[PDB]
Design an enzyme around this catalytic site. Structure first.
Site, short mmCIF file in Angstrom:
data_model
loop_
_atom_site.label_atom_id
_atom_site.label_comp_id
_atom_site.label_asym_id
_atom_site.label_seq_id
_atom_site.Cartn_x
_atom_site.Cartn_y
_atom_site.Cartn_z
N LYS A 194 -39.22 -17.38 1.64
CA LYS A 194 -39.05 -16.10 1.88
C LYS A 194 -38.51 -15.80 3.36
CE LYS A 194 -42.46 -12.55 2.95
NZ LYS A 194 -41.51 -11.36 3.24
N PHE B 291 0.90 -1.26 0.16
CA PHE B 291 0.01 0.16 -0.09
C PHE B 291 0.76 1.26 0.11
CE2 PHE B 291 -1.91 3.66 2.10
CZ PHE B 291 -3.15 3.58 1.37
F1 EWO Z 1 -0.13 5.33 8.22
C1 EWO Z 1 -0.56 4.35 7.66
C2 EWO Z 1 -0.44 2.89 7.94
C3 EWO Z 1 -0.96 1.88 7.17
C4 EWO Z 1 -1.89 2.19 6.18
C5 EWO Z 1 -2.69 0.96 5.56
N1 EWO Z 1 -3.87 1.66 5.73
C6 EWO Z 1 -4.36 2.42 4.35
C7 EWO Z 1 -4.59 0.93 3.49
C8 EWO Z 1 -3.89 -0.09 3.44
N2 EWO Z 1 -4.05 -1.48 2.89
C9 EWO Z 1 -3.04 -2.00 3.62
N3 EWO Z 1 -2.52 -1.51 4.51
C10 EWO Z 1 -3.13 -0.15 4.23
C11 EWO Z 1 -2.30 3.49 5.72
C12 EWO Z 1 -1.60 4.47 6.54
#
Ligand code: EWO
Ligand code: EWO
Lengths: 320, 320
Positions: free
Chosen positions: B115, B36
């Site tokens: 249902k 990410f």
């Molecule tokens: F400071 C941070 C730490 C972690 C993330 C993560 N949170 C967003 C999306 C995502 N997907 C997997 N990890 C993350 C974002 C900001």
């Protein structure tokens, strides 16, 4: 089928399919030929590991430039798309105004815009990407010519985000497709030069060039477009028509520079008299002048009848 | 604003926004935290070079887990979504059949399905991605609860492609959201344990847990869903309802295993008598049995009245 697998594939199959479309149909890639080769390898790699994801409809199975045909399938407009009543004489336009000043009082101003004698096209943008384009049909249902409209230079595939005007969630926008006069003639010469019959007028040429089973034919022709109305919209609530045009400009949709805002009938009539004398100077065909109540709230208190809006009217010149 | 710039940004802003949603709202990322971080850097890089593309609505400006609220905005169903007439006695169901056998002759078989006494939800998939979910409202317009429905474990974000059944272009599918009895009770204990009032019954609990301004509340609750009808569809023309369920299964939508196909009324009545005696064994609430003419062509020759389909009827048990 695992969630990241499916998000990955869609996003990449969508990206390569586009690029296939721009290279083959529009003859105008926006990435290099090299970059593209990276992309297609990856999607075939990913399709290797997960053979659920290779279907007859996958960009990796529509390889040359295949799978890109228009079939005119019926498709619904989000909002109705009605046709405009017409006025041919000074007395009828006056009568229309009288009636309009008798219902929504003196709060109504009139946007005045040049009526182009081309083909009505309705386009739908979903979060700033162009999803559908269709013809008028019967007002409720028209025909899918989405691929052909994607080749029109004037029609951005994606809306441009800006500070002043956020991209709506859904935007259904109406416009007219048409040929410039010089390009109508040049297309006619090119066609005769291939043994094909020429078109008798620019409207038929635009309609013909839009409605091509094979959209690459459309991409070869210098079709144009000018937006001139809104259908269904989400995340966008403009208070007037003239201000909605400002947002359309901002997002990159083509809009006309011959739109004026008139206060009362007398202004309306000067515009009609003016373009009666100068329309011949526009580089494309002008029919008349479409007069609309600019205020959207007044465009609700006044409504539409079963067949036509009550808040607009097309004044039509006599031809010659 | 250059074409590849805008294709790049959208595709990446869409990918990070999703991931933000799965991490924060659903507490269930599908990529690592590391991956990410790559993504979000890139989109901020790309937004560095082109400052047109940083708007208040950009994933890079909705950073913690903000920007994810439900507001129930009215949203239109593609197709009407009517409510089902009811039959309470053997004579009324017979009367319904007689009428149905008098119009589309002896070609009509009856799909019989349990249902569920939960909350109707209509979902819209556009080329295999979930675009909208809404409540019934008045049949034509309901409320946008798209974020809440995206947390329901039973609701795939994306449809699974397969050989036998190609993913429609548009699929509007209807179903019922509900709690299992054991989870209704467990949720009630958890709420009382926080000083909150418990729900009096599972239907109210599901409706309450679906309609959360903050969708993270919904993601914490073990809501379920079972599809049981089709609204508007494109690229999908199934000849029967029971065969459409097969495609829904195949694409990964949840479907019930208590659906049977009946030939004539007498079959219908055995199913109603059967579930009259055994419904109490289903782990969720069963109201009755919805009887539908299975053949879609017969579901057109028979139509719908202004308020209810003419080709279906819900038989309702008496409660106790
Ligand atoms: F400071 C941070 C730490 C972690 C993330 C993560 N949170 C967003 C999306 C995502 N997907 C997997 N990890 C993350 C974002 C900001
Ligand atoms: F054998 C080839 C050679 C070139 C391509 C390219 N045509 C597809 C899309 C695209 N975009 C930029 N170049 C390409 C495909 C197959």
């Amino acid at each position: 089928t695992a969630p990241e697998v499916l998000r990955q594939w869609q996003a990449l199959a969508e990206e390569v399919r586009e690029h296939q479309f721009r290279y083959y149909v529009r003859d105008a890639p926006i990435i290099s030929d090299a970059e593209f080769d990276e992309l297609l390898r990856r999607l075939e790699a990913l399709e290797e590991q997960h053979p659920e994801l290779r279907t007859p409809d996958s960009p990796t199975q529509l390889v040359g430039g295949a799978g890109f045909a228009t079939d005119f399938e019926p498709v619904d407009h989000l909002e109705r798309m009605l046709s405009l009543d017409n006025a041919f004489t000074a007395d009828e336009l006056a009568a229309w105004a009288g009636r309009i000043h008798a219902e929504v009082g003196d709060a109504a101003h009139y946007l005045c815009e040049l009526k182009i004698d081309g083909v009505a096209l309705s386009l739908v943008y979903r979060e700033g990407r162009l999803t559908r384009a269709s013809t008028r049909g019967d007002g409720r249902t028209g025909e899918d010519v989405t691929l052909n409209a994607r080749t029109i230079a004037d029609v951005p595939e994606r809306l441009t985000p800006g500070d002043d005007y956020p991209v709506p969630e859904v935007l259904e926008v109406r416009g007219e497709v048409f040929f410039r006069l010089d390009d109508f003639q040049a297309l006619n010469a090119s066609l005769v030069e291939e043994g094909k019959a020429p078109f008798a007028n620019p409207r038929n040429s635009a309609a013909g060039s839009l409605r091509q089973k094979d959209p690459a034919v459309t991409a070869r022709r210098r079709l144009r477009m000018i937006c001139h109305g809104l259908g269904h919209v989400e995340g966008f609530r403009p208070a007037t028509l003239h201000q909605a045009y400002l947002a359309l400009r901002a997002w990159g949709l083509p809009v006309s520079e011959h739109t004026t805002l008139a206060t009362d009938l007398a202004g309306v009539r000067e515009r009609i008299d003016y373009w009666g004398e100068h329309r011949h100077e526009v580089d494309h065909e002008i029919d008349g002048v479409v007069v609309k109540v600019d205020e959207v709230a007044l465009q609700r208190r006044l409504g539409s009848t079963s067949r036509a809006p009550r808040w607009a009217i097309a004044y039509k010149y006599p031809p010659e």
